[PDB]
Amino acid sequence: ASSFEWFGSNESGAEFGSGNIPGVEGTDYTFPNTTAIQILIDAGMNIFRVPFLMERMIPTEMTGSLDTAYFEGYSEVINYITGKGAHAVVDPHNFGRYYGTPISSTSDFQTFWSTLACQFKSNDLVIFDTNNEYHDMDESVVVALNQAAIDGIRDCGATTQYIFVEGNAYSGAWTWTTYNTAMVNLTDPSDLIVYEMHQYLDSDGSGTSDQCVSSTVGQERVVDATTWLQSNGKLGILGEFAGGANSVCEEAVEGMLDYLAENSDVWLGASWWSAGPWWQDYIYSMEPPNGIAYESYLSILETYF
Incomplete structure (x- = not known):
């Protein structure tokens, strides 16, 4: 049966046109399409990372209140997912940044979390992704922001839910020991x-390409990050990953994913980047x-x- 605990897809649209805050629903951005999620549940996908913006969710100050509309839009998608007994990763897709500025205050960032997590404390199925x-940014600030998030989360009474943490340098699996040791x-x-890491297989690991380095680069780019979790007794999930629509890329996705499954004692799952209504002709559209x-x-x- 199941090689991992979890397997799913990112569901993007609510984090789009990030050049536009607040931006208009249906023009700059949109929520995932529940019919299509369902098409991906029928199919065997049982976890879904749904990104959003911190700026649209709780405008002006991350100490502020929730935007009723945008959050009503957002919760509707999270609740459908869990509603069918699948895990729903709440992803403030903001890159450590609030209105362009690196987040530095741990207090505001926890007050951001306690306000978001509050709305989901009794939903066993929701998983929180810190950012x-x-x-x-500096490693110390990232560790402390990951620590604050956790605190505002638990402190609001969401003690049942998995918290997904994320490294600096784009929380990438190939550079995890270079930077995220701490x-x-x-x-x-x-x-x-759970230490949520991303891995892409192009030259620079940006994602932007449908060409892979090699057919082995996958298994290569996750040995270091794996031993780290084994050695320090931790759990991880490859939050984001993809390959281009060609043999070499696939070969490397299979090889990378083998290695993770052979190491399921520490790798709980993975989720394709990305599913969602507005991807269209995207190299990586699921x-x-x-x-x-x-x-x-x-x-x-x-x-x-």
Whole structure:
């Protein structure tokens, strides 16, 4: 049966046109399409990372109140997902940044979390993701922001839910020992921490390309991050990943995913980037009926379900 605990897809749209805050619903952004999620549940996908913006969710100050509309829109998608007994990763897809500025205050960032997590404390199925891809910031600030998030989360009474933590340098698996050695120290009263890492297989690991380095680069780019979790006794999930619609990329996705499954003692799952209504002709679209990674990878991914 199941090679991992979890397997799913990112569901994007609510974090789009990030150049536009608040931005208009239906024009700059949109929520995932529940019909299509369902098409991906029928299929065996049982966890879904749904990104959003901190700026649209709780405008002006991250100490502020929730935007009723945008959050009403957002919860509707999270509740459908869990409603069918699948895990729903709440992803403030903001890159360590609030209105362009690196988040530095731990207090405001926890007051952001306690306000978001509050709305989901009694939903066993929701998983909290502190922020997407901390980059070009100090390690200490990132560790402390991961620590604050946890605190505002638990302190609001969401003690049942997994917390997904994320490294600096875009929380990438290939660079995890270069930079994120110190993420070790983070603590949880519920002890439900998982080190969510991303891995892409292009030259620079940006994602932006449908060409892979090699057919082995996958398994290569996650050995260091794996031993780290084994050695320090931690759990991790490859939060984001993809391959381009071509043999070499697939070969490397299969090889990378083998290694993770052979190491399921520490790897709890993975989720394709990305499903969602507005991807269209995207190299990495898992949205049916005609998403390129749908036609390409869906038959490969349901080998591990």
